[PDB]
Amino acid sequence: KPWWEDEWEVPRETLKLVERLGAGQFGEVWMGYYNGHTKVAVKSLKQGSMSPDAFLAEANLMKQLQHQRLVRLYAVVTQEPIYIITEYMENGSLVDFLKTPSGIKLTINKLLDMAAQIAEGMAFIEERNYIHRDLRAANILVSDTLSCKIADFGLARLIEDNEYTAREGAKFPIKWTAPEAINYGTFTIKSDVWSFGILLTEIVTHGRIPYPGMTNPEVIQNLERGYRMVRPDNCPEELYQLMRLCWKERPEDRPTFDYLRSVLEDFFTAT
Numbered sequence: 001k002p003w004w005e006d007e008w009e010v011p012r013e014t015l016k017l018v019e020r021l022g023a024g025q026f027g028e029v030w031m032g033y034y035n036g037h038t039k040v041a042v043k044s045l046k047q048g049s050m051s052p053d054a055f056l057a058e059a060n061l062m063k064q065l066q067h068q069r070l071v072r073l074y075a076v077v078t079q080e081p082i083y084i085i086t087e088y089m090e091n092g093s094l095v096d097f098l099k100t101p102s103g104i105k106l107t108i109n110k111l112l113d114m115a116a117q118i119a120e121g122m123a124f125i126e127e128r129n130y131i132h133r134d135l136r137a138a139n140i141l142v143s144d145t146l147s148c149k150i151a152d153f154g155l156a157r158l159i160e161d162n163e164y165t166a167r168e169g170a171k172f173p174i175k176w177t178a179p180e181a182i183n184y185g186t187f188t189i190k191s192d193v194w195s196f197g198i199l200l201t202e203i204v205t206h207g208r209i210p211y212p213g214m215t216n217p218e219v220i221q222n223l224e225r226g227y228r229m230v231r232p233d234n235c236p237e238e239l240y241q242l243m244r245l246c247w248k249e250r251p252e253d254r255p256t257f258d259y260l261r262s263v264l265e266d267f268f269t270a271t
C-alpha cells in the first residue's frame, strides 16, 4: 500500500539514533529509541551504495514473515536516508555472543536449547514456503533473555514452485552453502537445512569457522569424495549424527526443520 496508508511508515522525528553498532559499504546499524521509550535497531541505507528499492526489499520480506522467532519489523522511513526499524536484540549476533564471557560459560544444554529455537524459527519459514539462503550464526540474533531469533532476510525468497535459481554471477559463502546451490544456483528449503548443519558446528565450537584448517577448494574436494566436516572437538556424537542428516547428498533426504526442532528439544530435555 502507499506509505500514507501503510502500517509501517513512520515520521523520522519519532526516532533517536544513540549508538552505531555497525557500519559497512551499504549503510549502518544503530541502537536507538522510538518515541523516546522503546529501544529499536535502525539500519540505514548509505545513499548511492545500492538501490533504494533493493534495500527496502528486505523490509518488504519481513512484512510477510512475522513470528516470535524471527526478528520483527517495526517500521520504515522511505525518504533518504532510508531506514528499516526493527526489534532490538540486546546480545547481538550469536557468532559474537558465543565468544563473550557469558556465551563461553553456556552448558551444552543451553546451546542445544538455542539450536532448537533456531530450528523452530526455520520451521515457520519452511511452513510459509520461504527459504532464507544465508542461514549462519552471524545471522542469528540473541535477546537479553538468551532466546534466539532468525535475522538478515535480505536473500530470503518466497518459493513459488519448488526452487529459487540465483543469477549466474551470484556468489555464496562456500562453507555454509549446500552443494546444489554452489554447483547450480539452486536453492530450496533443503539448502537451508544443510546450512543449519553447518550452523550447529558454529554453536558447539562457540563460533569457530567451519572446516577448521581448510580452504574452500579443499572443502569442495572433500565433499565430492563423500566426506563431511570432521567431528568438532567436544561435540556430542548425537548432535554430530544430526548434522550428518543435514548434510545428506540428496536434498530430499535431508530432514525438515520441524523434525530438527523436535529432536533438538529432546536432546535439550535430556541434558
Ligand SMILES: CC(C)(C)n1[nH+]c(-c2ccc(Cl)cc2)c2c(N)ncnc21
Pocket (backbone or CB within 6 Å): 021, 022, 029, 041, 042, 043, 058, 071, 084, 085, 086, 087, 088, 089, 090, 092, 093, 141, 151, 152
Ligand atoms: C549487525 C548487528 C548485530 C549490529 N545487528 N543488526 C541488526 C539488524 C537491524 C535491522 C535490520 Cl533490517 C537487520 C539486522 C540488529 C538488531 N535488530 N538488533 C541487534 N543487533 C543488530
